[PDB]
Amino acid sequence: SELDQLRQEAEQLKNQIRDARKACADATLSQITNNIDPVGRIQMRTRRTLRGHLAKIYAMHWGTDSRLLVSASQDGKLIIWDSYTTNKVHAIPLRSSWVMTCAYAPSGNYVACGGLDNICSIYNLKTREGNVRVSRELAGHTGYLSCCRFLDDNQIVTSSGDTTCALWDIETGQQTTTFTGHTGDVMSLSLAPDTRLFVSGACDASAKLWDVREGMCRQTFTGHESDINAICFFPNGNAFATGSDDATCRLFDLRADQELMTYSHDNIICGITSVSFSKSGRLLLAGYDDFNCNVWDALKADRAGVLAGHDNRVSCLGVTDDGMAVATGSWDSFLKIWN
Amino acid sequence: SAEDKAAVERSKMIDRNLREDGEKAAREVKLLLLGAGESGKSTIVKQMKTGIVETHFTFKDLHFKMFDVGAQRSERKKWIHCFEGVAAIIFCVALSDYDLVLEMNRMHESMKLFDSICNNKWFTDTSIILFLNKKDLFEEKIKKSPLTICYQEYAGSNTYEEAAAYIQCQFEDLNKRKDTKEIYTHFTCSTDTKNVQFVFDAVTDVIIKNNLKDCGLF
């Protein structure tokens, strides 16, 4: 009966980690930042409204120039916006309208999208022969595509509902690395600023830190009581925030290997759909199911503002690399640019 | 601004193609097809005519879109709101698998799935079309096997009329929202016709209710 011995060993092994994690918990994040000055009330106004989507918007992603952005929706269209003049630079029709994620290449020559078709499609924006055409279809996932992020002009990493993430090579279309270890569907991922590691929240209420080069899990973070819907890296690159279905947000530290602060309120009973940090990292912006995107003081775990301008669930969120705007898509088929 | 003005009229040309495609999209009827795999959805799909399969068919100048999501095998609640807005749900249950097992018999697996879909928060008013397939096999099977294997509380003659009508009542009993949603139950033969007509009639009632919503009557 080696199964009983292995299971017993793991339980003691798991308890040793908890003891080690509790040993390093010298204090709390609130106590350290108790002397910091409150951010005060923060007000943001809808500087622009982007219209043209005729169905629910499930994903958006900014370009690195802080001016162009791409948005996805279930009317089957991938629209590239000019966030300064509201102009529509491109409108890409998708083969399958069940699209759940968007990505903009940091170079700016490509965008990616995927969804219930279990495929990530790469689109070449800069084509000498006129229009925008598809470049590579990355097949090999068994579940639906939940998130995707360009590592470079030739490498993309994707998370799926088959509980595994993959690292692809766009030139050949083959999975360079497969990241396994989650027991539930992986709903989000977030590349590190140094593009060497990434995190991924799953339906098993656990987040895992991976190594792109080696291809194995490094740390596993727990504490959520339901599915992790969104995940985002801190600007410093040594922390990340999670958005789960229990209407709570948590901040995990990579080095301390434990949760630091919890962003919850009794007035909120709707789960988080998207999270994003500001350029300084002081503000944590989260999109909720109660139609309102909330702004949190990440250091003090205090509410600081509300982006109440949508008539349905805020499905996606974004902050420019310049940090001068926030774009908020929602199920009412509108994208709003704030401050 | 010479280049700015030429960019503005490019976007306006994109605007009208987006509106043109939305007009065409709104003229299609979207149906979500569910089942237990071996339930005969392949037969049902053939009657009207990896990832997610789309089926296209037309009936009486009406365009239908049937989405099959039987190949997902993932957490259903993470992608079931994508279909919140379909005209109707076509649920397929095989009547010949009351005694077969997957442990747990195959029929109770469908009832667990039917109960979850019917009482879903995203489907609180969408019409559910229930297709009880394999009526030929079930008719012959009850002669040699009793329905008490599936339902231990069943007390009735092992005839086709009495036994089949008992199974349907068990499925229609799972509908908790009996006042805000209607379940249309039909008995399907493997080799037959007029199943596409039944879907058309159930879809029309949804359209009529949709029209009354716009005019404020209902």
């Epitope: 000019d82 006129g130 229009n131 | 010479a2 280049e3 030429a6 009229e9 490019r10």
Partner: single-chain antibody, 226 residues
Framework: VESGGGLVQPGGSRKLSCSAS????????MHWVRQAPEKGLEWVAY????????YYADTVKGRFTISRDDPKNTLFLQMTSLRSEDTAMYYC??????????????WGQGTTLTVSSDIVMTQATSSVPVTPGESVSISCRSS???????????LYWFLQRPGQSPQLLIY???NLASGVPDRFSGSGSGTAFTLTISRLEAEDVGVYYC?????????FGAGTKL
Amino acid sequence: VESGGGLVQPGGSRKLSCSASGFAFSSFGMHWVRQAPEKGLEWVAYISSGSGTIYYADTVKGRFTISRDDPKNTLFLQMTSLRSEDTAMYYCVRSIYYYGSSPFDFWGQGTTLTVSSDIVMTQATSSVPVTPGESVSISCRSSKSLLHSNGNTYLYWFLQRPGQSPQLLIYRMSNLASGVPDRFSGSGSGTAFTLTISRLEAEDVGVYYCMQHLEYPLTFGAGTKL
């Protein structure tokens, strides 16, 4: 690729054609820039994508007519009163306009025909020594500062090698066109501009024209031969 047209006619009327091939011609605005037998280039007409706005040169405003046929991928120029001042080699140019596009990126082969306010770009220099391997610089100037409020200066640089059509090098005065070697560089200050070549090769000889794109009666600079 693109080409087409007629050549010989006395004082009268004629119609030119251009046959686009393999670049999604329906989403491109097209021009009809012409060049006299030994003068510089001069713009003629323009028809936008979707056949919306149409512009004409002031000297051919009433006589000329430009039209496009998106099916069959053809562009037309109709000329009615053909004087002797308008014998030239007529080129077809494609141009697309969105946020970061490169207009005037492709030029046709061109056809010759014979009959038997505005902004002026000076380009004072006309010919320079042809010694290779050096760092040759080409200057330009404009009547008014073509720096718009949106923050980009609409100045374009073209190189016409001897015996072939012009080729775009730099658009909006700083951006290097696709496929052009990184030797070429562009600088300016709104009114005075410069084009720099680091190490000139044997293929860099020819006339270098400058074009403006601020106000639509857009004009060239008579060139700068090497």
